[PDB]
Structure 1
């Protein structure tokens, strides 16, 4: 596994998030390195899931292509017969660095950020369900009465959040205050379009994507909106097994239930520095491979 990248200053670090290590390539370009780190109950595990970051990078490359005629993205075009390493300083091709970067890294253009977590919900679950049970609203938005847990909304809904800085669920009106009325409306409409297309596809493959979180940027030189993070993975979305879907109850987490159940059984939920046992690592890894193969139609290792 690649847990924490160590590039010895060859590129400056921009950020280390829960999963991605982000480096600055040059004035206009970033390198997004998806590590094998995994979180549960909003803490990072001590150890990693081998090749998780490769699988999730590739899954997202699949979705960018799937959506190529629907939305611009931040990827830098890599010329035919070249690799990312041709676009990086020579030292990063040395074995000690190439091993940390190969297959899990994306070269991306910097863009003007739109500072919103653009969540679209197709189904009522998570924090939305919690709110709804108490007050009959979702992100302050009035909902129909009688929704059951995990039920589909009449139409998928834009339900923005800030970024922590935990994240705060906000209304569309607040999003308009933050980023502008016109821009927020356009972001909302686009995100719902992208979500619906991908949710429908995934459902025919057997996975219900209950919700997903996008991040967008803008081209100030055209007003165009651009995806500025990778999309539609189990880290950015709530995946459920479609065959087992049943309203009125919670769904197993497609990706993380095995891990969550182990943590819960040991009173380790929310605890930092927790090493997952090998059987939990292996099974979680296998579940990422199954997600990847199911959604992309490609084979991981054959």
Structure 2
């Protein structure tokens, strides 16, 4: 018999994920079906999104050879029935206060920083780059979390040194770029560009660096369709473009420049979005989502 979620102490909530204490050395890392668009958590959940993203993360943890925080299988008996398939048993780490971002392509705040200054996180880039330009080598573009309201703040390597130590900063940079490169090549071979990605790391009792949080989900990474990659214009979000298009289209009745909370999504947009997540997962993993565990 699996424990109830109510048997565990809630210790943290994010926009779409939750964290629970299991015991002194383990946590329960829970994905919900919530989806964020335009910095709003939307009213409408995407069915099975939590399970699909958990499956994705587990696949990539298995693909990478680096130590990670997984502490049991996806069907570990410590996982409650209610969150089966969308929750992982993980080792408690001392988390390092750095958002470890790799960018293989120039978009979002990386592009904006470049357009304003010619540089991103201390990297002075070639002239003539633009939206969705390929970066080679990939850039380490670290960030720090800001207040409840603001977006993460881009920082340079010196800031990372000041946060975690000189040798540790080098390690974060090198590991971030190495594992991004591996995952990006894998995905591209399957027809998906991972344009960028965000990692969090922690340290275990021995001082070892351990990859944590979630890895290479479409929430932590920009997924693009490689078959439609066209430098110079904004690439469609593989998973979220239907949501984006509807919210900013003629049917929603919502003005994005209002910063008022957006309206609920049509059921068929939510179902279509679920299908995009499943397609991304199956293409990348070579596995069938119908085989992924659930309640």
How high is the TM-score relative to the length of structure 1? 0.88
- Provide, for residues 140-171 of structure 1, a one-character-per-residue CA deviation record: whole Å limited to 9, x for no partner: 42111111321111200110000232211111
Q: Which runs of 4+ in 1 moved over 3 A?
A: 268-271
Match status 1:19 vs 2:4: no
Q: Indicate conservation of the 8 Å contact 1:205/1:295, yes or no.
A: yes
Count of residues in correspondence between the two structures = 280
Question: What's the counterpart of residue 4 of structure 1?
Answer: none
Query: What is the aligned counterpart of 2:132 among 147, 150, 168?
Result: 150
Work out the CA distance in 2 between the residues paired with 1:288 and 1:136: 35
Work out the CA distance in 2 between the residues paired with 1:162 and 1:48: 28
| Mapping 1:197-276, distance limit 5 Å | 197-221=182-206, 223-265=207-249, 266-269=253-256, 270-272=259-261, 274-276=263-265
Work out the CA distance in 2 between the residues paired with 1:27 and 1:208: 39
Q: What displacement does 1:8 show?
A: 7.1
Question: What's the counterpart of residue 84 of structure 2?
Answer: 102
- Provide, for residues 171-210 of structure 1, a one-character-per-residue CA deviation record: whole Å limited to 9, x for no partner: 1111111111110111100010000011011001011101
Work out the CA distance in 2 between the residues paired with 1:123 and 1:83: 36
- Provide, for residues 244-287 of structure 1, a one-character-per-residue CA deviation record: whole Å limited to 9, x for no partner: 10111111111111101111123353543631111210111110
Work out the CA distance in 1 between the residues paired with 2:263 and 2:173: 38
Q: Indicate conservation of the 8 Å contact 1:46/1:272, yes or no.
A: no
Quote the RMSD (CA, aligned, Å): 1.6
Q: What displacement does 1:220 show?
A: 4.4
Work out the CA distance in 2 between the residues paired with 1:55 and 1:247: 29
Question: What's the counterpart of residue 268 of structure 2?
Answer: 279
Work out the CA distance in 1 between the residues paired with 2:68 and 2:107: 28
Query: What is the aligned counterpart of 2:75 among 77, 83, 92?
Result: 83
Work out the CA distance in 2 between the residues paired with 1:102 and 1:226: 24
Q: What displacement does 1:133 show?
A: 1.4
- Provide, for residues 74-114 of structure 1, a one-character-per-residue CA deviation record: whole Å limited to 9, x for no partner: 11134xxx932x235xxx4xxxxx2x211111000101111
Unaligned runs of 5+ in 1: 1-6, 93-97
Work out the CA distance in 1 between the residues paired with 2:281 and 2:272: 14
Change (3 A) 1:281 1:133: same
Question: What's the counterpart of residue 175 of structure 2?
Answer: 190
Unaligned runs of 5+ in 2: none
Question: What's the counterpart of residue 73 of structure 1?
Answer: 68
